[model samples]
Target: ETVRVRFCPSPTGTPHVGLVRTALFNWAYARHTGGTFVFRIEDTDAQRDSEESYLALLDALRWLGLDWDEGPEVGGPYGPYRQSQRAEIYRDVLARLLAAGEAYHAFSTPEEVEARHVAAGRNPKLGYDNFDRHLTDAQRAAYLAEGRQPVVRLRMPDDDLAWNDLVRGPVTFAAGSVPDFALTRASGDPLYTLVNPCDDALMKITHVLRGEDLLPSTPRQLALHQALIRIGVAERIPKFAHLPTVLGEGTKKLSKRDPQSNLFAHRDRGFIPEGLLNYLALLGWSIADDHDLFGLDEMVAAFDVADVNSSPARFDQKKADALNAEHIRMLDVGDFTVRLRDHLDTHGHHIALDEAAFAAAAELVQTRIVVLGDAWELLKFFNDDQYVIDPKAAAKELGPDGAAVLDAALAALTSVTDWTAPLIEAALKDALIEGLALKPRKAFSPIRVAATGTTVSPPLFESLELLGRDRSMQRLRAARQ
Candidate 1:
């Protein structure tokens, strides 16, 4: 059979790192095997889902370059990728399931079920005791007369459910371990427990790759898939691959509330797709020979679901930054400039500088910086005439002998006919180093502070050339007094 994988996310909130990781894995698997990558939106929860969130999901995938072969925007054989739009399909499946006796109407309220469990000396939290499994016609009519509606529930089989997981091998759920879950609310709204499996079957999705948080729900879904097959609504049970949890600062799995879990935050901070994907891919899987830095092509070429580790992966922000810096440094100067420009535009930073000047500054600090925002801030002084000199940096670098050095440097720079990097270097060396008899380090400290408003910046000569003779002299003159 042709390999088929899916990324189905519910529209609720911002797409986080964990969600993106699932999408990336699915996309990679599809590309690797030349299979169909289906992107479905599970928006059955009307109260929590929103159009903004739905659009954001689309934007997230597009930004990550995780293209789908069939999804919301792109039509496929299984049209109406959004679950909300496919309500009729779910209703039809539910009807067939009920007609085939694979499903039944459940009328047990939460309070009644919990009371029943308590009276039976079992924990109320044991969930859905299957109390309404055998409600007779008279009892059902009584409940209806009392203004109670029935929810649709699958009749979980008595046998132990087991499946060979794509990532985790030979997983099983014991009989009675998974209670019959509600597929629809009393008001007739489809819950994820039902719609998810039904859509997966309808879409012909062959592989279900998701996080381990949903591991407990696997048996219920598998049972539902079996029922769908029995009712002639599905062909076969799909393969499952449960990825390990991605933990944040603490040992707990990354929660949605955590800002670090937000995927767009990294992108907003100028994380290139290469870097973010490289870091994300390392969460549970490693490359051959322990190499971490890799391009998408390399990842796609080497990715194997079987090679993924079963242990939980920690989200080390420092490591992610390091990986981002590595990717930034790997970029050619031209490509870095293009990416930086895009970053600036996305973040609404209209840093007004000529392309050559910006490119020159970027190249100088590209190795020294981690993100595009850092590079932009470092180079911001280049365009700002009112750039505030750092008080601490100014005091430390422009104390005793500051006036004499600034005057001498100003004199040397004013006399230089050609304002080039080489010329500027020779002039500064003559005036500050050899002429003034100061150490090269001590001599350039004041000039650097005056020229860039910071003790550390790009190389002095190159910055001076970029700053031009006039701006250099102006900053030096202001520093002399």
Candidate 2:
């Protein structure tokens, strides 16, 4: 069978990481099979949807490098990919379905339905009972006479619905288990239940890969697909694969309200696209047991939707940070420098280090950093004239003997003509450790805090080498006084 997949998201708010995972899987599958990848918007809710959120979706996908074959900017055989733009098409389909008795008008309000359920001694949660399926013209007229506008409801099939899910295997929904649901509100607005499957049929989508949260809605969409086939809109029902949910800190599914769930928030905090994509790919699927880290080419080569686990995946921010750090270290020095510069630029931080100095600083701290922004704190000392000393570090490391240590350090380095990491190390070691008989920690801790404002810093000698002799003497003398 030909392969065609789509990522349809509502323009509600900031794009969630869970949503990105769906897009990644679809894009990966399309790339793997050499099939078409489609990006469509389900902006059916006018109140919640905004152009800003819509643009953000496009931006998010572009940043992640998940390009689509047919989408908003690019044209496809199916014009008007967005659901909001395809209202007339949906109206036409609904008209045909209604005329052919595949759908019926129901005048029951939510309160009326609940009242009926309660009166009949049935659980109110049983939902719509298909009460108006057999309503006659006279009956509809009676409700219309009472000023009750009817909603369009699709007629469900009498037999059980079954389909072989791509991820979870065969699944079935018995007949009558699913009640008739609304296709359009009383205000003539089409609901997602109608628009989603309608677009799938119209766009000729072959695979329906989405989160498991939509699994229960599958049977309803399948019934609608059968109706569409009968009405000559769709040739066949698209195969579905309900991916596992991504849980947050608690047992509940990830919420959009959580900052960690926001994709751009993670990006802003210095998550590289490659790293984020790798972590997301591991949510429900893995490339191998022995290895969890791989490049995009390897992922596209090995990704198979069927291999995805059925269990939910946990979103551990700490683990994600570790993975991000691994990806950062994998970068070449040149690429790392460019990315770090871009990250710094994005955050409006400007440092006056030359390319050579920045490269040296980056190499020293690359292994110690978890994100790109981390490089700033470690390397900021390279640009500052008079460094701010950490108060606690100053109190502990710069005691009564601190002035004496700095005096000796200045005296030893005063006449050293050669300025390199090795020379700086020798000068400091001789003055502080050998001359004063001070241990290495006690010897260098005060200088470290004075130079970089913290006891925990980049390699001391290398940092001093980068700081140059003049500034190093200045911070040491200042700390002494």
Candidate 3:
């Protein structure tokens, strides 16, 4: 049978890196196997969900180039991809489950359940004990007469729940170890537990590839799946696969509360989708043992769920930056310059850059940067309005002797017939290094600090050439102060 997979993210918070990784894996799997990749939004929670977060989920996926065949905006056989929009569908399916005796209503409060556990000498914290599984119709009516709403609980079969996980191989949850779980609250509102399975079945998802944190919840989902199949709401239960945890700073699961976990935060810091996706892919899978860098298409070509290491992957922000730096270098110079310009425009840095000058100087900034954002610092001097001498650079490199050194440079450079990096280097060398007999460091430090505002810039002669004969001379004279 042809495979189908889905990535469902709840629009409650900004997209997280861990969540994006799950999306990437499912996307890669679908592309690799020529299957449908479904994107669904679980926005049924009214208090937590927002239009802004919903829009961001779409933007996040589009930015990373993870296209979906089915879901919001791109309708498929399953329209109304969001649970909030599919309330009728859930209501109908839920009604059938209740009618078929596959699910039952439980009216016991938490305090009641706890009291029962204590009376039985069981751990008071033990979850629901199926005590309400066999409630008489008269008993249920009594609670209904009292104006108490009952939570819908799935009838877990005594048979063990198990599945061969795509990533982890054989895994089983013994029957009776898991109690009947709630599918809806007393308010008749369906829980995520109920909504997810209903949508997956309706969408015909063949595989459920998600985080291991959801591993414990799988048995609950599986119990519902069997009931769903038996009741004819679904043709077959989707296969289950649990991905390894993505640890954040320290040993805990990456938290949505952490700024580091926010997907847009990293993007704002200048992570190109290519590098971030590549690094995210490596969180559990790799293309080859020799090299870690590969394009998205290459990832699609080589991806296989079974190849995943099934071990936890750590999120190292610096490592992510390093990979992003390499991917930035891998971009063609033309593409790099354009992307840098777009990044600048997005960040509201709207400098009127000279494209010709930027193209000539971009390669210098490109190789030196770890992220697109870093390009601004290295290339800011390319814009006259944006350039300013760093006080610290001036203090350290250009001092009491600064004027004498720059005076000779100004004279030699002014005498040049042609303003080229080579000719420029020649003039400064003769006057400062040889003529003045000063060391190269001593000769060039003040000149660089003066012209570029920082002693650490691209090759000074090349920068001076890019700055032009006029601006270069003006800055040199100004720095002679």
Candidate 4:
């Protein structure tokens, strides 16, 4: 049978970066084995779901080029891929459990639950007990007749549950430890738990790949699946693979409330998608051969679901940024031009430089930058029209002879024919080294500071060529002003 896996995300908030890693691994695994990759939306929380958030989720995945075989955009034989669109599926499944006495309706108020937990000195997470499971239909009717609200809860069994996790290995929890779980609201709409398994069974999803946060819920889901199979409802139990948690700087899970945790912010800062994916791919599974930067195809070829480490992986944005810089430096000039153009088009103010001008800037900054956004930092010198004479640069290099040096340098550059980097460098080297009788740093650094506003920059000769000889002389002359 073809290996089929599904990734489900609820439209609760901004889809977190952890979601990106989960989706990427699933996509890679599916492609690696010639299996089917499915995307499912668990929009059971109607109050939190919005069109904006939903579209943003789609945009994030699409931007990263993660295509799915089954989803809202890509229709499949087993969808209404969106959970909200298939409420009846969960409701009907719940009805089956209810009719068979496997689930029950509870009328406990939240206040009572909280008070009881506090009185018992419990963690307040004591959750709902099977307090109402044994109540007769007449007793439930009496409570309902008295205008008491109700919540549908699964009446959990008493045996210990056990499962082998692809990442965490053997994980077992006592049934008593897991309180009776809620299936839905009194209005009969399904909870995330109920709808999740219902959709998996209905769609015949064979494997579930998700984050470690969902590990605790696996036993609950497994219990439900077994219950369904025992009653001749489900055909088989799906395999579960819980990916290791992606923590923040330390040992905690990545929090959405933290601005740095926003994945889009990484893209906005000029991080290439390939670089981001490469970094995310390393969190739990290492290539283990001192190899960190592999292409997507290489990652797919080398990926092993069993290789994921059980411990959490802390996210280091600084390290990721450094790696991105390495990736950027490795790009061919032509490819760098295209990627840099998109970044500039989206961000660089419409100063409206022509293609050749932009290419010159792209070439100079492509090697110097870690990300496309850093292009602006390097190009700021060329783009700044109101170039202020740097007082520090002037104090150091622009002494009394600075004017004469600028004049002779401009004359030598103007006298050259080709006006390329080689010609410009040769001309400047000969004149600044011999004709001016000034030291290398004294001769070139002053001119760099005078033409651009900074000491550090792309090569001065090529920059002067791009600036054109006339503008170059004009800036040099203005140095004396």
Candidate 5:
């Protein structure tokens, strides 16, 4: 049968890198196998889901280049992709499950459940149990008469549930782990527990690829699958693959609120989607080559369920920086220039025509930078509206020699026929080094500090070349004070 997979993200908060990892793998799998990739919104948590967060989830996936075949954006045979939109569908499913005796209602309130747990000497976190499953109709009626409400719970069998995972191979969780699970609340609201299985059956997803955290819940899902199949609700059980989780700064699950975990935070800090994917792909899998950087096509071509590593992946922000930096440096100068300008524009930096000059000079320093944000630090001089000249540079070099250095540079540069990096370097060498008798660091340090307001920056001559003959002299002349 043709394979179908889905990536379901709740729109309760900004999606973290961990969430994107699952989506990325699912997307890659779909592309590799010629299967359909469905994107489903598990927005069952209406209290937390918001318009902003919902839009953010869409934006993050789109930014990652993980396109969905069917979702809120694109309708499929499984219409109304969001759990919120499928309320009526869930209600109908609930009605069917209720009628089949596969599901039952518990009239206990949250307080009553808590009280029962406390009385049993169990942790309050022990959660609900199967205590009310066998309530007599008279007892249920009596409870209803007392205005006691009920939440729908699914019946779990005594035997274990088993499934083979594509990544980890065959695994089984004991059935009693979640003996009695929730399908819907007494308030007539469907839980993701109930809605997901119903939707997957309706959509005919052939494969279930998700994170490891969802593994515990798989038995419940599997049980539902059996029940649905028995009742002719679903045709077949989907194959399952639980991808490894992406760990945070420490070796724990990445949190959505964590600045480092957020996919947008990386984009805001100038990370490329291709580079992000390249880095993310390396977390729990590898290509045959030693080189790690790859595009989406390369990933799709090389991806395999068998190749997925059975280990946790640490989220190394530094390694990601290194990978992206290499990608940036490997680009041709022209392409690099275009992307750099686009990045700057998107990040709220306006690129002037002469901006190319600064980047050309700064290309040497680019090798040393781990992130594009470092590019700004390297070229702080060329974009100077006001200079923050170092006090030490001023006290030592801004004496009479500073005036001579600036005056000679302005004169030589203004008179030069070709204002280029090489020409600029040679001119500065004559006056600042030979004429002024200043050492390389000492000679340029003052100008570097004065022109760019920092002692460490991009190559001065190339910066001057990019600044053009006009602005270089203007800054040089202004430095006379």
Candidate 6:
């Protein structure tokens, strides 16, 4: 059978880490099988949904570097994919379901249902006791006369419901555990439990991959999928896969409230999509136990839903940074410089760098930073007038012995006919390293501070060459005074 998967997300405020992970897997699955990837916006809850967040969802997936074969921008056979726009379609499906007795009206309120459960010596927390399923026409009329509106609910089967979960293997739900859940509100507003399956069916989505948090809704969705097929709404039931939860600190799953869960925030901090997507893929699946870094194509070649782990994965910030640093190192020098320039513009640094000079500078720092944001600090010395001395580096490396070392460095550097990195190193090694008998670390420390305004910088000779011989001498003279 041809595979089709979707990455449907609610237009909530911010896209969470788990949400991105879900999108990554679905997109990977579709690409792996040469199938279609559907992108849908579940924006039915008008109160919480807005145009602002809807556009954000689109921007987010684009930033995450995940593309869809069919979605909001790229239309598929299902033209109005958004649940908000497909309300009429939901009405039709619901009407058909009612006509076939696949769904019925449920009028009992929460309090009334709980009261019935309590009176029967059962736990009141046990949701909806399916009391409305047996109501007679007269009983339903009496409730309507009392001004009570009824919510539409699926008539669940009394037999056990089960599915072979793509990730967790087999999963089963006892007949009575899940009550007859409502598909529409008493106001006739279609709920998620209804619209989610309806769109999946209408879109002919073959695989449903989402977070484990929605695992409880599987049995009901499975029943609804079957109901739709019987009523000629859908051709067949889609396969189900529940991904493992991404945990934060300790064992708690990362929630929206956690700062680390925000997807855009990570991008703001300079987590490139290449690294973020690779790391997100590792949250559950890996290319190899010994290997962790690979391109998106490599991932698609190996990605299989059945191979995903059932155990939860932890989101380790330090580990993520380390992985991203590897990708930063893998970036070409030209693009690395361009990305750095973009970073400078994004942060309003207002300094234009020559491509040749910036690429030279980028070579020395690109491999050194975990995030692109970390590049500014190490390369800011290139900003010339805008660069500030780290007070402590100045205090520690620009004093007494440092000034004395600067004297030797300046004298040694001025005499050099050629102003290149190797020649500068030779000048310094002769003056400070041999004449003064100072070690490489001790000889370069003060020069590093005066020329770069910080003790920690690129190699002293290379940085000085980039800074030019005149600026190096000027800084040394200034630091001496």
Off by over 4 Å in 6: 118-121, 350-352
lDDT of 1 at 159: 82
State, as a TM-score between 0 and 1, how close model 4 is to the true structure: 0.91
lDDT for every model? 0.85, 0.87, 0.86, 0.79, 0.77, 0.85
Residue-level lDDT tens digits of model 1 in 1-481? 3788999988888999988888888888788888899988887775555888888899988887888899876879987888878878988999999999888998888999999999999999998988888889999999999998899999899888899988789998887788888899888988889888988998888889999889888998999999888888889899999999899989987998888899888888878888899998987788786678898888888887777778879899999999999999999989998888777767767556688877787788879888778866676667665366888878877776887888787887788887788887877778889888979986788899999888887888888889888888888889866
> For residues 269-379, could you state the per-residue lDDT of candidate 5 as single tens digits?
777777788888887788775877777899999988668877978899888998888877776776666666676667666445465454565456557566666665565
Q: Write the per-residue lDDT of candidate 6 for residues 119-151, one digit (tens) a residue.
A: 999999888999999999999999999999999
Clashing pairs in 6: none
Better candidate number, 4 or 6, judged by lDDT:
6
- Where model 4 places Cα greater than 4 Å from the true spot, the runs are 47-49, 108-127, 350-353, 384-388
Residue-level lDDT of model 4, residues 1-481, one tens digit each, is 4878887877767767788889898888888888888989877675545676778788888887888999987789998998878877677788888888888889988777788788888767777756787788899899989998787887677888888888878888975888788888778678877888878877787778888888889988987887677656788898888898888986777888776577788888888878888898988888667879877888888887778787768888887887888888778888988888888778844323578887877878877887788777567666556456678777665667766667666666667766566677777667777777778765687678778766777788888877776677777777754
| Count of clashing residue pairs in every prediction | 0, 0, 0, 1, 4, 0
Mind sharing the TM-score for model 1?
Answer: 0.95
Candidates sorted by lDDT, best first: 2, 3, 6, 1, 4, 5
Model 2 residue 79 distance off true place after TM-score fit, in angstroms: 1.9
- Models 1 onward score TM values of 0.95, 0.94, 0.95, 0.91, 0.87, 0.95
- Winner on lDDT between 3 and 6 is 3
Error of 3 at 475 (Å): 1.3
Select the stronger candidate by TM-score from 2 and 6: 6
> What pairs collide in candidate 2?
none
For 327-444, candidate 3 gives per-residue lDDT tens digits of 9999999998888888887897654547787677777788898887877777677678888899998887667777778888888788777778787877777888987887988678
Error (Å) of candidate 2 at residue 105 is 2.0
Worst window of 10 by summed lDDT in candidate 4: 345-354
Instruction: Predict model 1's lDDT versus the native.
Output: 0.85
